[PDB]
Every structure is written in C-alpha cells, then in structure tokens.
Design an enzyme around this catalytic site. Structure first.
Site, PDB file in Angstrom:
ATOM      1  N   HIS A 184      -6.303  -7.270  -1.122  1.00 47.98           N
ATOM      2  CA  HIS A 184      -6.593  -5.909  -1.368  1.00 47.98           C
ATOM      3  C   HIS A 184      -5.647  -5.498  -2.452  1.00 47.98           C
ATOM      4  O   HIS A 184      -4.456  -6.058  -2.642  1.00 47.98           O
ATOM      5  CB  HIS A 184      -6.014  -5.281  -0.154  1.00 47.98           C
ATOM      6  CG  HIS A 184      -6.664  -5.296   1.143  1.00 47.98           C
ATOM      7  ND1 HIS A 184      -6.533  -6.304   2.019  1.00 47.98           N
ATOM      8  CD2 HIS A 184      -7.864  -4.806   1.440  1.00 47.98           C
ATOM      9  CE1 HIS A 184      -7.370  -6.305   3.081  1.00 47.98           C
ATOM     10  NE2 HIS A 184      -8.216  -5.380   2.760  1.00 47.98           N
ATOM     11  N   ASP A 235      -5.134 -13.218   3.160  1.00 51.17           N
ATOM     12  CA  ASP A 235      -6.486 -12.255   3.698  1.00 51.17           C
ATOM     13  C   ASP A 235      -7.471 -12.601   2.670  1.00 51.17           C
ATOM     14  O   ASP A 235      -8.285 -11.883   2.575  1.00 51.17           O
ATOM     15  CB  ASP A 235      -5.931 -10.903   4.011  1.00 51.17           C
ATOM     16  CG  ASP A 235      -5.485 -10.042   2.966  1.00 51.17           C
ATOM     17  OD1 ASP A 235      -4.934 -10.794   2.059  1.00 51.17           O
ATOM     18  OD2 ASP A 235      -5.641  -8.882   2.977  1.00 51.17           O
ATOM     19  N   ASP A 266      -2.610 -10.922  -2.702  1.00 58.99           N
ATOM     20  CA  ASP A 266      -3.397 -10.468  -1.441  1.00 58.99           C
ATOM     21  C   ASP A 266      -4.783  -9.821  -1.871  1.00 58.99           C
ATOM     22  O   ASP A 266      -5.145  -9.606  -3.107  1.00 58.99           O
ATOM     23  CB  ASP A 266      -2.758  -8.801  -0.852  1.00 58.99           C
ATOM     24  CG  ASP A 266      -3.005  -8.687   0.512  1.00 58.99           C
ATOM     25  OD1 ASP A 266      -2.374  -9.285   1.368  1.00 58.99           O
ATOM     26  OD2 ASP A 266      -4.109  -7.823   0.801  1.00 58.99           O
ATOM     27  N   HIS A 291       0.762  -1.121   0.070  1.00 55.86           N
ATOM     28  CA  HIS A 291      -0.024  -0.024  -0.058  1.00 55.86           C
ATOM     29  C   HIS A 291       0.818   1.073   0.134  1.00 55.86           C
ATOM     30  O   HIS A 291       0.490   2.312  -0.121  1.00 55.86           O
ATOM     31  CB  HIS A 291      -0.933   0.045   1.193  1.00 55.86           C
ATOM     32  CG  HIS A 291      -1.967  -0.852   1.031  1.00 55.86           C
ATOM     33  ND1 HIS A 291      -2.942  -1.027   0.170  1.00 55.86           N
ATOM     34  CD2 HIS A 291      -2.358  -2.060   2.109  1.00 55.86           C
ATOM     35  CE1 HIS A 291      -3.798  -1.958   0.401  1.00 55.86           C
ATOM     36  NE2 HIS A 291      -3.390  -2.667   1.423  1.00 55.86           N
TER      37      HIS A 291
HETATM   38  K     K Z   1      -4.243  -8.005  -4.888  1.00 52.43           K
HETATM   39 ZN    ZN Z   2      -4.590  -7.332   2.699  1.00 55.21          ZN
END
Ligand code: K
Ligand code: ZN
Ligand code: CL
Ligand code: K
Ligand code: K
Ligand code: K
Ligand code: K
Ligand code: K
Ligand code: ZN
Lengths: 321, 321
Positions: free
Chosen positions: B176, B263, B174, B138
């Site tokens: 996210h 996750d 991931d 991130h």
């Molecule tokens: K991802």
């Molecule tokens: Zn994540």
C-alpha cells in the site's frame, strides 16, 4: 383550505393518513420528467456512477450493501479513482448512504415526486407537498451521504429557475444542516439558502453549517446558517425562523422551497431540540406569512408515532393562514 | 547475527521465530525516549486528542469501540468540531483505525520500538529491525487510518535528522501507498520519500500515491511514487525497486529507513501483486547494495503462514551483502 396537493410513490403511512384525515388535499402519484432536471444539479459522472454502481458490485459477487470505507479527507488529494469502492468514497462523505439493489430507482423516483409537486406550482398551484423518500438535503452535486442520494429540494429549486423565475429561496427546517443544498448553491445569488440545524460543533454533519458561511463569489450574502445549541426550544428556534423568513422576503424570492424535516421533535431519537407537535402548526403559520408560492419537500424524521402529526401540522398551519 | 530486533509485547510469533532461527541477531525490549520525538512529527493537538479519546468515550458511557462515521470530504470544511466523533472524523480519513481500551498505549509503544532501533543505528549499528505493531505509514501529522495511529517510520526518520544527519530517505515497500509518510515530508527535501505500491487508482488509500505527486515547494522532486498494476511480479516490482534505490543514492541519503510491509506476497489475501518468498531475498540484497545504514520498520502483512519467512528473508538477504 383543501388546496395543497401531495405527491407520493410504515412511515409514509402516518404522513399520508394524516394528509387525508386533516384534509390537506388530494394525493397523486408522480410523473416522469426524465433525467435532465436531475442533471441540472448532479454531474453526469455522478449520475452515471450511481446508475451502474450496484450492477458493478454484483459483477464481483459483492454481498450486502455497497458502502465506502475510505474518503478523500484531510492531507489527501481529491482525485477520482477508477475502482468501484475508490469512486464510492470520492462521491461520498460518510458511510450513511448505502447502495443496494433498488437504491437508484428509489432515489430517481423521489426526485420525480419533487419535480411533479414542483410542476403543480408552475401550473398555478400555490403550494404542494413532495413526500420524498429517500431525503435529499445532505446530497451535494456529486457527493452522497446521510441517506441522501439526490438533492430533491435543490432539483425542484433549479426547476423553478429554469422555468423563468429570477430568484427563489430554500428554507431548511430539518434538524440537520443541508450541507449538500448549501454546497450546490454556495456561489450563486439566484437561490438563497437558509437553514436551522443543530450546531455542527456537536451535530452531524460537523463540517458545514457554521454561521460564518455566507457564500463565495457572487453568492456572498445568500447563504444564511442558523446553528442553534442542543436543548433549543421554540423561543430560540422560532426566532431563527422569523429572521430567516424576513431574509427570504427581502431577497425577493418568487417561490420558496421548504426542506421539511421534522426530526427537531423532542421525542425524535436523533433530535437534540425540544419542539412539540404544536410548534409545527406555528412553523406552518409563519412560513405562510411570507405570502409566496411554497413547495414543501420531505426530508428527515424518525418514523415515530407522531411523524404524521408533526409533518402535517406544518401543512395544516400553512393552509390556516 | 549482526542486526538487532526491537519488539514489545500473532504475526510477531512467526516473525520472531524466524528471526531466531535464521540467526538474524539479538532481540531486545524497547526504551522510552518520550513524547518529544513523536511530537517532532505529530501535532500536540493530535497527540492529546488521540490519548484522551478513549477516556472521553467512556465518560459518555460509550458502548464499544470508538470510530468515526463522518469525514471532512469533498465540499465540506476542514474545520474542527468540538464533538468527540466529529473530532475523530476530522483526525481520520477512513474507518480502519478504531480506538479502544489499549490503543494509544499500543501506538505509543510501537513508536518507542521504532525509536529504539533508530537509536541502535545512531550508536554505530549498520542496521536494526523495528517490529512495530500497530504499523504507521498511513498516519499523517494529524490524520489516522489504515490501522495506523502514529507514523513509526517517520518518527525514526526525523530522529536521524535531529541527531545530526542532513539527508535521509524512506523506502516504502509495503503493498500500500504510505500516504501519511508522503504527507509528512511532502514539502521537505532533507527526507526523500519513495514508495512502490498498487496503483491508488484501484488500491487503498485511493487518494494518494499517483506518479505525478512529486512534492510541494522545496520538496518538489523529492517524492517518488511507483504505482504498479494488479498482477505485477518481480520483473516489474524489482524494476521499480532498482530505480528507487538508484534515486535514493543520487540523493545522498545518509540513512535509509525501509517501511517494511510483506503484503505484496502472492498468498496474502490483500495483495494484488504476485511476489514469491525468494523475491524478498532479492529485495534485501538490492537494498543492501545501496551501501547505506538501514533501519527496517514493520508495516503491513496479513498473518499468513509465511509472513515470518518473507519478512526475515529481506533481512537475511540484506545481511547476505
Ligand atoms: K508502499
Ligand atoms: Zn499494506
Ligand atoms: Cl436527514
Ligand atoms: K436521495
Ligand atoms: K436545517
Ligand atoms: K446561494
Ligand atoms: K512509509
Ligand atoms: K519529501
Ligand atoms: Zn435530519
């Protein structure tokens, strides 16, 4: 003069008490001018999101305030999501505008207080006092923040233009930048925006209020920021005020809308300026020196014991001249 | 075991234990490759700010954790204040990367862990596992958030380039979107970025990760986002992965760097996907099917019981092929 009218729906205690005590004028509750005048400033999407944001948050058994935890800051796309928190970030710039069960009604009501007091001046009065809570000057057209949900001062100013005034001017004496009010009129020349705030180099809101923001497009020349350094007292602050009022007068503003925050006070906890209660009389006497119809709209100020004295000194001084 | 693990100093317990049990390979402490490779990705102004932030906070008797509370969001200037907190919100996009006493040394150490595993592969290993904490995907060049301060995967990606390679590819599995990694290589085409993730229209980081973000300039067409609806399982998730791996190979990646988050697991509290423990085996085999030297970089994955099982399944299934 017992001529200025106050509009009202712990802290408003001290203000309202001092309004009677110093005989500023009568107090009245607001009237409801609807959603249209608010939507003259705030986008329909933003107002719709705001109307249903808490209901949506109760649909998920959300406990506590509704709050954003992500924002579209640098390197990200400024693109509207559909999840409720994703949109709350889109429509916000800090975690300072919490949404609860009564936030919308409360915000809607403040805009009406502003609009009521606005309509007093249209119906002949020379000045009025919109005692608004929540404040509004940190709210942009579709961004909320800093306990500001709707921009009362900008909504009242837009009302004056829609009612036939060629030009009007906002003077923002709050300790903080009116980043929302600036953003709303940044590219227009029928509304001049002046602001005296703590320098965003060190002070909230950090990302607007620099002196080199003069407007864009046709609004170039009609945004004037007066950032002052921490520790500022009346000799600097009031010299900014003098320059700002002269500008308003040369712009031929027909009404001036005063964004009246008194969190410049030396005893205010969020303040870094050193103004004393006498300074607020002087601020009213100078604002009155412009000779224009003047609408005062409450913005910031911690509920210190002297908030009524500080705020009503501006009105007192105004009526003194 | 043929795949080395680099680890520094609670999820790690389960993961290392499963790395030992499944005989994945040796486990080795990192080395210090210095600031320079971290700085091929992150600005020196960002690195100096981040490394001095805690110290300035303690010099103004800061109460507890250092966090931002304002961000240069919509209608604000992306212009850097001097204030510690203003600077912090300038270098962040959310409130989920706090800075406390050990933070920059911890982030520095993960980047070093990633660089050591990258280095094992340059020296002739076909694969390696960087057990990084905190994660990295991130963080952009000079933006932090989402518990990510330095982009581990991107630093190791660039090391592969600086050590000879023309083309590399990043695979972000991931749950996210790896917004910071997409940002770092957005106008580049020697580094192909791909990501499968919960559709940002509802999932964090909200403001990057749409399918229409294909890259900028000569990076056009070299950024491939696979956003997926909530409730997605392996028929959909494995389809994205199968298309992403096809496209990495069409790209002539010489090294593939996998930003490994678990996750996506059905029992992970943050996930809105329904992946099962055996699915991570299939994942590992499909990456290994690509035929490429492969660096695995830990990202997200809440510390559930099965985190070690899931993560090590990707490595097991990789080594099965
Ligand atoms: K991802
Ligand atoms: Zn994540
Ligand atoms: Cl305020
Ligand atoms: K408001
Ligand atoms: K101001
Ligand atoms: K303007
Ligand atoms: K990544
Ligand atoms: K790229
Ligand atoms: Zn204020």
């Amino acid at each position: 003069v017992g001529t200025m009218l106050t509009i009202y729906s712990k802290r408003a205690d001290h203000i309202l008490q001092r309004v009677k005590d110093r005989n500023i004028g009568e107090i009245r509750e607001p009237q409801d001018f609807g959603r249209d005048p608010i939507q003259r400033i705030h986008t329909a999407e933003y107002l719709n999101f705001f109307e249903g944001a808490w209901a949506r948050w109760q649909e998920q058994d959300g406990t506590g305030d509704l709050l954003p935890y992500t924002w579209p800051a640098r390197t990200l796309s400024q693109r509207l999501p559909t999840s409720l928190h994703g949109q709350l970030g889109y429509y916000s710039f800090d975690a300072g505008a919490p949404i609860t069960a009564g936030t919308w009604q409360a915000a809607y009501s403040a805009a009406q207080v502003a609009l009521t007091a606005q309509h007093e001046i249209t119906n002949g009065a020379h000045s009025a006092f919109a005692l608004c809570r929540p404040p509004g000057h940190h709210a942009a057209s579709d961004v909320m923040g800093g306990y500001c949900y709707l921009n009362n001062a900008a909504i009242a100013a837009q009302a004056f233009i829609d009612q036939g005034h060629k030009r009007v001017a906002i003077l923002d004496v709050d300790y903080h930048h009116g980043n929302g009010t600036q953003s709303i009129f940044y590219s227009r020349s029928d509304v001049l925006f002046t602001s005296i705030h703590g320098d965003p180099k060190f002070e909230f809101p950090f990302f607007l209020g620099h002196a080199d923001e003069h407007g864009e497009g046709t609004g170039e020349g009609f945004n004037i920021n007066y950032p002052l350094p921490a520790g500022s007292a009346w000799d600097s602050w009031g010299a900014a005020l003098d320059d700002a009022c002269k500008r308003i007068n040369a712009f031929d503003a027909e009404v001036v809308i005063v964004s009246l925050g008194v969190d410049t006070y030396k005893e205010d906890p969020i303040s870094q300026f050193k103004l004393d209660s006498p300074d607020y009389l002087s601020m009213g006497e100078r604002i009155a020196a412009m000779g224009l119809p003047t609408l005062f709209v409450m913005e910031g100020g911690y509920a210190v014991e002297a908030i009524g004295v500080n705020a009503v000194n501006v009105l007192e001084g105004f009526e003194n001249v």
